[PDB]
Structure formats: structure tokens, C-alpha cells
């Protein structure tokens with residue numbers, strides 16, 4: 001049945017609650033972003049109002065064939081009225097079109113649902129600074145202090161310099177990047193840009209990127225694999241077998257593959273610095289796992305919450321085990337005592 005942490009008290013609203021059939025008493029279904037665990041259940045046969053960002057609304061229409069009459073896109077940073085309740089969508093710094101949702105309840109409670117986010121100090125200067133938040137529904141994906149990772153900027157720097165060096169040493173090397181959902185486009189776009197290539201991809205993936213309002217996208221991507229030296233493939237194909245296979249398909253145009261797997265966290269982060277990352281190599285194929293995250297590190301999450309000073313926190317991730325729940329509540333208490341709210 002729909003879990004309580006997907007329901008917004010004092011409204012008829014749910015968030016990211018599309019897989020439970022008809023939720024009893026729900027008058028509006030919000031969707032924070034176009035990732036499958038969140039949209040699971042939507043299709044062309046959905047007949048209730050869906051509230052989301054413009055970009056998420058492009059993907060509902062074009063990829064899932066949801067009917068236009070039921071898509072209600074809202075502009076960001078703008079006070080809007082939904083079934084008599086004031087709401088605002090804010091940028092979540094996750095994947096394209098991902099938002100956080102501020103709800104202003106008739107009784108005077110203010111609720112922030114983060115969706116999926118990577119907390120950033122820039123959020124401290126949005127509409128959030130302007131009033132108090134009583135309840136926070138928080139993306140707790142990496143809520144544990146072992147989860148450190150570099151800035152997105154440092155990771156992109158590493159990837160650009162790596163690719164550029166490899167291709168300039170060997171002009172017959174191909175670069176490949178894995179993907180399984182929207183998000184992390186900076187990885188492959190930044191590499192293509194330094195190499196003066198377009199990124200080549202399947203028709204299904206090109207269609208997906210064409211929904212995302214990226215400026216100058218027609219200049220950066222293509223479905224012609226032959227004219228491109230940066231190829232995107234499913235994440236599943238990023239391994240020695242899948243890459244040898246792909247290399248055979250290119251018909252002796254290339255003699256080396258350099259491949260990137262943008263993982264979330266991996267346990268080499270406890271020890272290793274970004275400077276010090278090394279590939280796994282077999283023959284003429286090298287594979288780099290890089291820690292490009294679109295979720296908050298532990299410290300970024302702690303700073304955001306200690307800044308917001310909410311009265312109650314409701315976790316949305318890692319809630320399935322008692323040991324996880326109990327550990328998270330312990331960190332919430334430390335943060336509160338240390339900051340004095």
C-alpha cells in the first residue's frame with residue numbers, strides 16, 4: 001500500500017506514488033523527476049492530474065506517452081495554486097528537470113519535499129531563505145559519514161584531461177561512456193567538447209536528450225555513430241566482453257577503447273583521492289569508474305539541514321531496515337544538538 005512518507009498531510013497530495021494503483025483520497029500526483037523508481041506506474045492510460053517540471057512533462061509526453069490533458073507542468077521559482085494550496089518548485093541539483101517541492105498548508109505549516117537532490121550552498125539563497133520550514137522529507141541516500149566524494153567540477157576535470165591525453169597520444173582510440181537513465185550528461189558532453197566530436201548514440205537515447213532543453217544540443221549529439229569518437233552505450237555493456245564486441249562493430253576504425261563508468265559511491269573513496277584513480281585494463285581496453293554523484297554527500301546533507309533547522313525530518317531513502325532507520329535518527333539528533341535548534 002502507499003507508504004506514509006509519500007503522503008503530504010492536510011492535502012490530497014502524494015509525491016512519486018504511481019505504483020500503488022488509485023491512492024484513496026489523492027487529488028493530485030506530484031512527480032519530482034523522470035527516474036524509473038519514481039515514475040514506476042505511469043503510462044498513456046493514466047487519467048489523474050500529474051504536476052511536474054516542464055522538462056519532466058516533455059519526457060512523460062514523449063517517452064511514456066502520457067496524454068497532454070493530464071500533464072500539468074509548472075515553472076520553477078514561482079508561487080502557484082494547486083487544488084487550493086500554494087506550492088513552489090525549486091531546482092534539486094539532481095538530473096535534468098528534477099525538483100524539490102515546497103507546500104504551504106492552509107493551517108500554516110510549511111513542508112519541503114526534496115525529491116532526489118544534491119544539496120548545495122546555492123540553495124540557501126532560493127525562496128527557501130524567506131520562511132520557516134516545519135517538516136522536511138529528505139533524500140537520505142548517502143546519510144552516513146563514510147560517504148565522501150569530490151565536487152562534480154573536479155570529477156569532470158579529471159575526465160576531460162584523461163580523454164584528451166589518451167586521444168592525442170592515440171588518434172585511433174575510441175571513447176565510450178555508460179548511461180542508464182537521464183542525469184550525468186556533463187560527463188559525456190564535456191569529453192566530446194574537448195575532443196571536437198559529437199556524441200553518438202542510439203535513436204532511443206537521442207530522443208530522450210532532445211526532451212531536456214539543453215542549449216545547443218543539436219550541435220553536441222547525433223545518431224550517426226560513424227562520424228563520432230565519443231559513443232554512449234547502456235551501462236550494462238561497460239565491461240570487457242561488451243566493449244570488445246562493440247570494438248568489432250566499428251570495422252577497424254579504432255584500435256583502443258577508453259571507457260567511463262560514472263558510478264555513485266564506491267569504497268575506493270574512503271582511501272583514494274580523485275588525482276589517484278586508475279583504470280582496470282585488459283589488452284587494448286581501459287575502464288575508469290568515476291565518482292560523479294547527483295546525490296548529497298553526508299557533509300553536504302548535514303550542512304543543508306543544519307542551515308534549514310526543520311522541526312521534524314522524514315527520510316525517504318534507506319527506510320526499509322530498522323538498523324538504517326535507527327542510525328539515521330541518531331545522525332539527525334547529533335546535527336540538531338550540535339547546531340542548537
Ligand code: NI
Nearest residue numbers: 033035094116
Ligand atoms: Ni533519482
